Structure formats: C-alpha cells, structure tokens
Amino acid sequence: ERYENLFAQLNDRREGAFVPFVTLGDPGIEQSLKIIDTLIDAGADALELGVPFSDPLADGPTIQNANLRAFAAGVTPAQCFEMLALIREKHPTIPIGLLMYANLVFNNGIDAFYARCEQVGVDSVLVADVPVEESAPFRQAALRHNIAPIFICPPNADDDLLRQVASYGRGYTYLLSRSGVTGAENRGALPLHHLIEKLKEYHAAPALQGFGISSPEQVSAAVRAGAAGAISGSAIVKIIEKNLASPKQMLAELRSFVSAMKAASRA
C-alpha cells in the first residue's frame, strides 16, 4: 500500500521517485541509522536496503565492500531486522524494500522470513538470485504477508517475461539498465522506453530504473522515458566509502547528493 500511495502522490505532483540503496549496518549500526535518516531528510521517496550477505553475486565491488564493512562491524540479519523495525517506527509512510539473496530468505523458512518482514513493516522484497522461473514460493509467501515481490525486467526481456513480471509483481517493477552487476562505473547503454510502454500496457507495477544511475541527468532521463523513478546504490555507497574517516562530511555529502538527485525527479 505504501508504494501505491507514494506513486499516486508523486503522480499528482508530476514527480519521479528517487530511491537510494545502502547496505544495512555499513559502516556500523549507529552510523547506518544516521545515514538512512539523512537520505530520507534530503528527499529519498523510498529506500532499498541490503542485508549483509557472504556471497552477493549480483553486486559489483562498491557494494561487495559495503557488505564487507558491515561484516567487519559484526552486523547480523537479526540486527538488521531490529534496525528495520526502528526505521519504520520513525517513518510511517516511506516504502522500505529489501535487497536479499535467496539463502537468507530460505535459511529459517521462507514463510517465517516474510512474516518477520511484515512484523517490522517492510514493504517489498527483491531476491536477487531468484529469477521468475523459481519465484513461486517467494512471491506466495510475500503476498501472504502483505509484502510486494519485486521482479526484474532485463533489457532483453521477451513478451512472455514482460507478461509474467507484470502479472506476478507488486509495488514496483525493477527496470534493469543493463547486463552485469551493480556499479556506478558502468552506465546503461540502451533506450528502455519500449519496455516501459509494454509494462504499462500489461498493468505492471510502476517501473523504477536501476543499475549504474549516478547522475541527475539519468534520473531526469528515467522520468522522461516514462519510468516512475530511479534507484541509485553504488553512487550513494561510494560516498560512505570515501568518508569513513569523517561521519560529519559523509552525512553532508550524502545530503547534497540525494538532494540533487531528488531535484532531478521533477518532471
């Protein structure tokens, strides 16, 4: 419901959504909570939040290193769920989506995972190593617990995939910029407006473009192409990495960056 409400409100304001990604507990629990509050205060419309995992095989080096920093700080999934409960306790309406890998969801039972997400007030879950072909028990558990299952629409999607993602997804449809893994160092190289149009025809959840978004012009480009908004991860995380030695400068630079990226969503 939080996504539906957000998109309706943004629609009324003719705005795109700007959605940052960070790793929970990077570089520690306390600084991570401050990071996330800063992202919100600076204009994030929703969040994508990673639980540290040993084998993040959809992530490039920037987010590999974020996972490693969280592990160095001793961050566990249980602590991440404590963090999520507190985040929701602070912010009533912002959509909170998790970026998971399958083993963390499967570990103590798929159903129990999504039940915990519901209890803490998460809104969506994207499981990066579960394609639509394997999605059935994840999407079922999600919907039973009022969690939106997030599906990936790759640049090379055929019609059947578009129809499946449109049908099974909720919250938003993830519109992949390009092949490869997360990272600000590689920009998408393909126009996606055709996929965006087909998704709308099939009544899919609104599209957010993600992968390699690091600049205001890319946010504006996403909106201009018909997407509902854009996700940025590595660019955000790089600011953390760069500023580990100065939490104050870190938060300042995060604020400036998110503010600029959100400004670009006007359109």
Binding site: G60, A128, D129, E133, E134, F151, I152, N156
Partner: protein, 395 residues
C-alpha cells in the same frame, strides 16, 4: 521454461539473477542439440582419445588386498592428460562454447586443477581463457597459477568475501552476467544452476561406462560397489552414472571429514550440512546458523568447498547412493599405503576414496567384495603437503 527438468527431486534448480537466465537457456539448448549431433560426438571422442588419452586403464591392486577377500581395481583417471578427470568435461564444454559461437572462456578454481584443465582446453581449441581464483588460493597454489599462465590464460585474484573458492565462483558469475553473449562459463564441477549438473555428468560418464566394460571383461560381472570422493560431485557422478540402473551395484561417495565431523572442520555438507540456496542451486551446504555460507576444510584443496552437486543429494535421499566421510589422517594413511604397495602416488582427493575402500576391506576381511575406486587424479601436486605433515610428526 526449459527442455530438461532443472531439479533432481527437491535439489538443484536455477537460482541465478534474471539477467543470466537467457545464458542458461542457450547453454541447455546447445547441449541438448550437441547430444544428438554425430559430428559433435565424433569431435569429442577424437579429443578424448587422441589428445587426452582415453580409454584409461583399470588397474588391479593385488598387494594392497592380499590376505582378504576384497578384489580392488582403480580406474586410472590419474593417467588422463592433465593428471585428473577434469580434462574430460572441459573438452566437452569447450566444444559447446564453439558450438554457440563463443571465443572466450570464464572459469573458477580453488585448488587450481580446474583452472589448469580450463586453460589447456582453451589453448588447444583457440579460446581466450580467464580464470578467477580466490586471492588466498592464488597465494597457496603458485605452481598451478604458473601452469595456467604458461598456457596463456589470464588468472585474476579475487579479494572479495573470504577470498577463496566460493568467492571465485561468485566472481565468475558476475563476469558472465555481463559477457555471456561472447563468453562461456566453464563451471568446474557437477553443481551450480541447471544445466551444469547435467552437462558435467554427461561429459564425465565415460568413466563409469569404460569401468563397466573393463570390469565385465576382467571379472565377468559388475562390481559390488564403486567408490569416489565428492568435492563438488563430478568425478563421482561420472563413475556412478552408467551404474545407476544397475541396482545391485553400490554407489559410495566419500566427503572429506577434515579434522573430524565433530570438530566442524570438514567439507561434508551432504551428510553434515544443511540445505540452502547458493551458487545457483538448492543443495546441502555448510552455513552459519543465520545462513551465511561457511568456510569448509580439508587437507585436500580439491575437496574444500561448502556445498555439493544436487544429483548426489537426490541419490542420497532416495537411498540409491550412500555417502560417508574420511578424515585427513585416514586419507594420509591411504596415500602412503598406495605409494608403498602399488607404486602409485594418488591425489589426496582420491586418497579419501581409497581410504574408505581400505576400511571396507579391513573391517570385514572375510567378506567377498569386488570394489572399484575412481582414482580421479595423481598426487605429485601433494607431495609437499604430505612431506610437511610427516615432518611435523617426525616420521
């Protein structure tokens, strides 16, 4: 949607990012096509015979079983070009890469043997080869790294995660996620997402097929059991496959018990792990209580991986195959035994299989039994490791 079932019972599947599904579908189609193609099969047979040296000997080991009712044969994959069974399937995967019009190979390696096998096939068949290897493994496997580089492969250290084999597996898939239109991922065992467990089995099944012909010729009957170690599952499933429907034949897989199961320092997920989802498959793995992939351990690097191929988990669940463990010390003893009694230096990996056969014999020395151990590799690579242990012991 696939041509073949991606699962063996509840185990297996295709747990990859959406971006990679076309890569897996393409590979599955190309495999199914190749398996019907006489030209492909002839090219593969030609490489296996004239380049790799198939068929491999089946050696009767009379000294080691003297005064018992065990007859023990060793299937001599240690004599294959490269000195391990891996050469068989890398040749077939290289041909599939060519079939699909690809000119680049990606491979992961831990111990370095798969890296060497990938590099040699790539050199022979004119493919560019890049190999990912955890930085800790690069540090400890200088000889194999140098061999890969001599054969013109690029070897790329991986510093993420735990800087070991699982991290190399991840990096290989990361690369493939962004390169599959031009590059084939030459996965090194019968594990990972469908269709790799199927392809690797089919490209190793000559081991068991030859063994069956050779044992019939020499003994006039099928073996009572065939025994192979299990690192990811390739040599074992290659020995097992042709015997699966021969239900009188025991299929025994040997996982590394390391310092002992009870110590937690082992590599025996099939029997002592917990089912999880990682490296594209639902399979037993070694993991923390909260689902992080754990550090495996064995004296033998070839066996040191926290999961296992899905067909093994399936054959176990239905009781068609039995899985056991052997500790570092048992493996070392079998290593020393084979050297002294048969003049064969086995891979420490293979020493696990032999150790279990020696236990079957020694525990019940009056039981008539005809056993085959898959001697999947030679052990020249291991003599430093063995030297150093024996020295610390003052032997």
């Amino acid at each position: 949607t696939t041509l073949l079932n991606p699962y063996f019972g509840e185990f297996g599947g295709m747990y990859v990012p959406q971006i990679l599904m076309p890569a897996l579908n393409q590979l599955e189609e190309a495999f199914v096509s190749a398996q019907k193609d006489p030209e492909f099969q002839a090219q593969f047979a030609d490489l296996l015979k004239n380049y790799a040296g198939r068929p491999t000997a089946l050696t009767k080991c009379q000294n080691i079983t003297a005064g018992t009712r065990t007859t023990l044969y060793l299937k001599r994959e240690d004599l294959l070009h490269g000195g391990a069974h891996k050469t068989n399937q890398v040749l077939g995967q290289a041909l599939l890469a060519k079939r699909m019009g690809k000119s680049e190979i990606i491979a992961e390696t831990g111990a370095g043997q798969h890296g060497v096998a990938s590099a040699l096939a790539s050199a022979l068949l004119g493919l560019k080869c890049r190999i990912y290897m955890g930085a800790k493994d690069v540090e400890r496997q200088s000889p194999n790294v140098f061999r890969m580089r001599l054969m013109g492969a690029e070897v790329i250290p991986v510093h993420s995660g735990s800087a070991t084999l699982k991290d190399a597996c991840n990096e290989a898939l990361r690369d493939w996620s962004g390169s599959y239109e031009t590059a084939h991922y030459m996965l090194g065992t019968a594990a990972g997402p469908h269709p790799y467990p199927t392809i690797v089995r089919e490209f190793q099944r000559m081991i068991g097929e030859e063994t069956k012909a050779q044992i019939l010729d020499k003994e006039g009957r099928l073996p009572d059991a065939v025994i192979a170690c299990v690192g990811g599952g390739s040599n074992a499933i290659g020995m097992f496959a042709d015997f699966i429907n021969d239900t009188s034949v025991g299929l025994i897989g040997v996982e590394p018990g390391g310092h002992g199961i009870e110590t937690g320092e082992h590599g025996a997920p099939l029997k002592h792990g917990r089912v999880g989802i990682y490296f594209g498959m639902k399979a037993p793995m070694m993991q923390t209580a909260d689902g992080q992939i754990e550090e495996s351990y064995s004296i033998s690097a070839g066996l040191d991986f926290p999961s296992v191929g899905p067909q093994h988990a399936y054959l176990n669940s239905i009781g068609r195959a039995d899985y056991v463990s052997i500790t570092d010390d048992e493996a070392l003893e079998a290593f020393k035994t084979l050297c002294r009694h048969e003049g064969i230096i086995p891979a420490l990996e293979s020493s696990h299989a032999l150790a279990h056969a020696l236990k079957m014999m020694r525990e019940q020395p009056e039981k008539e039994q005809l056993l085959v151990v898959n001697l999947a590799g030679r052990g020249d690579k291991d003599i430093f490791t063995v030297h150093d242990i024996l020295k610390a012991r003052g032997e």
